[PDB]
């Protein structure tokens with residue numbers, strides 16, 4: 123089997139991407155944030171505290187003939203950005219782009235934090251990291267990809283995120299028309315539960331490539347590119363007037379600037395992030411100070427190749443017995 127679904131930016135800055143997902147019988151379609159940095163499939167639901175729902179589409183398990191309460195199971199997750207959610211668990215039929223999993227754990231939110239309430243466009247998350255990170259207790263549950271894997275034509279999914287445009291998540295096959303050149307594969311460590319890999323270095327604009335190992339995670343659920351302070355300082359030093367602002371919480375730059383590209387290494391290959399991908403717009407409405415898309419990972423504890431980086435590439439999440447990641451230009 124295979125599946126193929128379009129993923130769409132939630133706003134004009136590509137702050138996140140939503141992908142339609144069918145849950146239950148008859149189908150209830152919710153727009154979920156596919157997140158390779160977590161491993162819970164959770165949804166706004168008929169059980170979510172009413173004051174914490176503001177425009178999201180909800181899953182109502184009582185209206186699904188295939189929903190079954192997973193007795194005694196609860197979940198609670200807090201994303202390293204400070205947001206959080208928690209609730210109880212059903213199993214139900216879940217389909218993405220024509221690929222169906224029966225008995226998928228669907229985590230129904232009873233509580234969500236304010237940042238979720240305040241985002242009416244995201245109806246939940248679909249985790250695609252390794253199932254060892256799944257928070258369901260007392261019986262940990264498998265991700266959609268892990269449940270689907272043995273049925274797939276090939277045990278892979280691919281992320282092809284667009285810049286200010288829709289893109290695609292594919293399951294079970296590699297669309298050879300969706301990238302240029304070849305796919306370069308690189309080793310993954312699963313020890314922390316993430317798609318963790320080591321970039322071989324970077325370049326700023328037309329500058330020379332610096333060979334240096336940068337350990338990080340491939341995280342579709344993070345908007346920006348978080349890299350060591352040395353690398354980020356070298357990048358922003360090429361932008362007249364850019365500075366790190368403690369009051370704003372990162373590097374900002376004059377909205378009148380044209381930004382240089384940023385290149386990262388994948389083995390001997392190179393992925394080029396165009397400068398425009400690094401512009402996240404005014405820090406507040408009407409401001410001429412713009413927020414940067416490359417920020418320091420100091421204090422996160424890991425580097426994060428978020429959407430800014432991933433959208434410059436066609437990315438293969440290879441879930442074979444020994445997982446690997448693949449990157450191609452596009």
Ligand SMILES: C[C@@H](SC(=N)N)c1ccc(Cl)cc1
Pocket residue numbers: 157158159160201202203341342343344422426
């Ligand atoms: C791994 C992601 S959270 C996710 N993808 N669900 C993350 C952790 C910590 C920080 Cl500070 C920022 C991002």
Ligand SMILES: C[C@H](SC(=N)N)c1ccc(Cl)cc1
Pocket residue numbers: 138155157201203205237238241244247343344345
């Ligand atoms: C999964 C990501 S966490 C991240 N951006 N690193 C997320 C999405 C929406 C909200 Cl409101 C909070 C967190």
Ligand SMILES: [Br-]
Pocket residue numbers: 409410411
């Ligand atoms: Br300002």
